[PDB]
A paper describes a structure:
In nature, these structures encapsulate riboflavin synthase, an enzyme that converts lumazine to riboflavin. In the structures of the AaLS variants, the pentamer is the common and exclusive building block for all assemblies.
The resulting variant, called AaLS-neg, encapsulates proteins with complementary positive charges. For AaLS-neg, a similarly well-resolved spectrum was obtained that corresponds to a 180-mer (measured mass of 3.02 MDa, theoretical mass of 3.01 MDa) in agreement with the predicted icosohedral T=3 structure. The secondary structure elements of each subunit could be unambiguously assigned in the final EM density map refined to 5.4 Å resolution from 26,769 particles. This conformational change, which modifies the wedge-like shape of the pentamer, is likely the result of electrostatic repulsion between the anionic residues that were introduced on the lumenal surface. AaLS-neg and AaLS-13 possess 12 and 30 such openings, respectively, yet maintain high thermal stability.
Residue numbers in the entry:
A (entry chain AE), B (entry chain AA), C (entry chain AB), D (entry chain AJ), E (entry chain AI): 1 to 161
């Protein structure tokens, strides 16, 4: 049997990070957790690419560009939605998830979903700020594993060629 | 009438297995279910491909890779989804079913949906211990039928060309 | 004005039938209704193509290959969803609906939807009587009509060229 | 560790079927189940042997002779018991279960038990028409595994020699 | 497919009959029933062997003798049990059915169960006068078909040799 999986070492890897500004209190907290887990899991931070955009809606369009760089191996989606805006929450939420998924299948490059949807500010300030459930921590880690995963997929992809 | 279908021999076939890690006490019995059902329906296991991925989300981006190799006849999607988060489960749920469905139409290769959604860890305990219903068994078998069917369709689509 | 349309004669035409097995009692009921209207309204039964798969999920990936041979003109989707499985109902019906739709767009060849979603056994009985409500009867009628329709269009696409 | 188990390929195997005529409305549905599961599992139906006997009582005595042919690998008992007569049900069920047991011990050749004791005709309509719990289907499957098993026990029975 | 089954001609055959005398008013009817169904289904009756024993218990020991003769092809059990007492009925009933069962599996020669257990002499008066249910007739019939079955099976058991 052939087994593919990614270890968690952040060695030799270049990451993308896409960051909103809306609710900057908790998002800024999230990116913190992302950078940290990157560097401590063995990676260098000069390859972190952080792109900022105003709100949740624009997250997709930006990442689509970051991935068509040759030297960003994986990309970290980062944003927050909290049911403050009721007509937009429906359409911004389902569509961003949807657009991110389509981006990855297309480009064949892992994009990970680091978006808190917290139904209130009380559920938001307790996760990102109090509990180690630093959502950016984990989406960051999952992407690391994906990076080494396509390193497994594509390193064998050249040995066969 | 021209009747097609799949008999159930797994002779000479090569399979894809994508595996999540989350709630590994359950996933792993499912994976076992796929591997066993294969080899006990005639197949050999060095041509099974085993990939491990973090959670339900990354299933498509990875499985799409397994279908762009030539030497895979059908890919078996294996993940579990249990109501942990109201924000995460809904969106990622309809998204995996989507991404899987679309890849299958596209790459012209079967992808099966061996994903538990057991409304509790306990309704996953009833599916593996109370009755034969080990979903990895059943969706993997469906996959065998699809591979022999597509072999039926493409062997006759080799005689008329 | 140029009026395009399809008569209801089934001569010169070659058909597709994609047939599940789940809830066979109801599905046999419908496939009989399908081959019935076909050979009655002017066809032979020798160039009907009848493909069988386990459940509703595979309906797409199967029909997708059937309409990709040269000789299959219109395809008659045939399957049953009754609210037994709770995740397979919502997602496996949303994506087969959407899925078969996008196939017919792409291939430019009529695929009809003869999948009942009858919420109980008693709508499964008032359709399963000979009281015409055999959804395969009507759906197979529509694709016959669409069959000679794309004859009218594709043949008129030959006189213009 | 030496693991002995049978895969499910029905390749090259020759089978025994013993089928009563009593209550044949459902028994016939069984034999259908058996022949199918065999051939769909890679077998060819020329090597199926179908024996007919009046009631339940004769099932053992005949089967015993079938397995004393050299060219029969496994034998599928098929019959129906429904509480008709007091002497019939009690004594014939106890002695069939004991009889078929002893025969397999002595002959050193598997005999599986596809006799339903459905305590009503309606518990056999719920064994057959509302589930795919086709008793002969699975009793046949177990027999396939048994044949491959004694294939395993008897192939290693000739390499040690 | 090969179907072995018994036609019903009693030509060329030789039979064993073992008869208790107890409750002779009715046994006599049964014995006559057997002789009839032999002679009228073509049998000649000088090759019928009729043995009489006292009560129910001694049935098996006697049949063992008749089946060890080379020239008897099938043996008919004939005896009557009526709940004259609970001490004898439970154990002697289980033992004859048992002893008979082992006699046939062993000697490989069909033995029929022509024992009425009628819960009163009035279930035996209803068995004999209300409907043709002449149990000796019926089990004698089954013995004919079994004789011709083993004729079929053993005939092919010499053409292969």
């Amino acid at each position: 049997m052939e087994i593919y999986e990614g270890k968690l070492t952040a060695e030799g890897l270049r990451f993308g990070i896409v960051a909103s500004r809306f609710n900057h209190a908790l998002v800024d907290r999230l990116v913190e957790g992302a950078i940290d887990c990157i560097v401590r899991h063995g990676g260098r931070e000069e390859d972190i690419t952080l792109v900022r955009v105003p709100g949740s809606w624009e997250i997709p369009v930006a990442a689509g560009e970051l991935a068509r760089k040759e030297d960003i191996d994986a990309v970290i989606a980062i944003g927050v939605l909290i049911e403050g805006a009721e007509p937009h929450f429906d359409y911004i939420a389902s569509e961003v998830s949807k657009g991110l998924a389509n981006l990855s299948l297309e480009l064949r490059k892992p994009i990970t979903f680091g978006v808190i949807t917290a139904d209130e500010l009380e559920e938001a300030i307790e996760r990102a700020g109090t509990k180690h459930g630093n959502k950016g921590w984990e989406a960051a880690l999952s992407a690391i594993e994906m990076a080494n995963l396509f390193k497994s997929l594509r390193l064998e992809h050249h040995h066969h060629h």
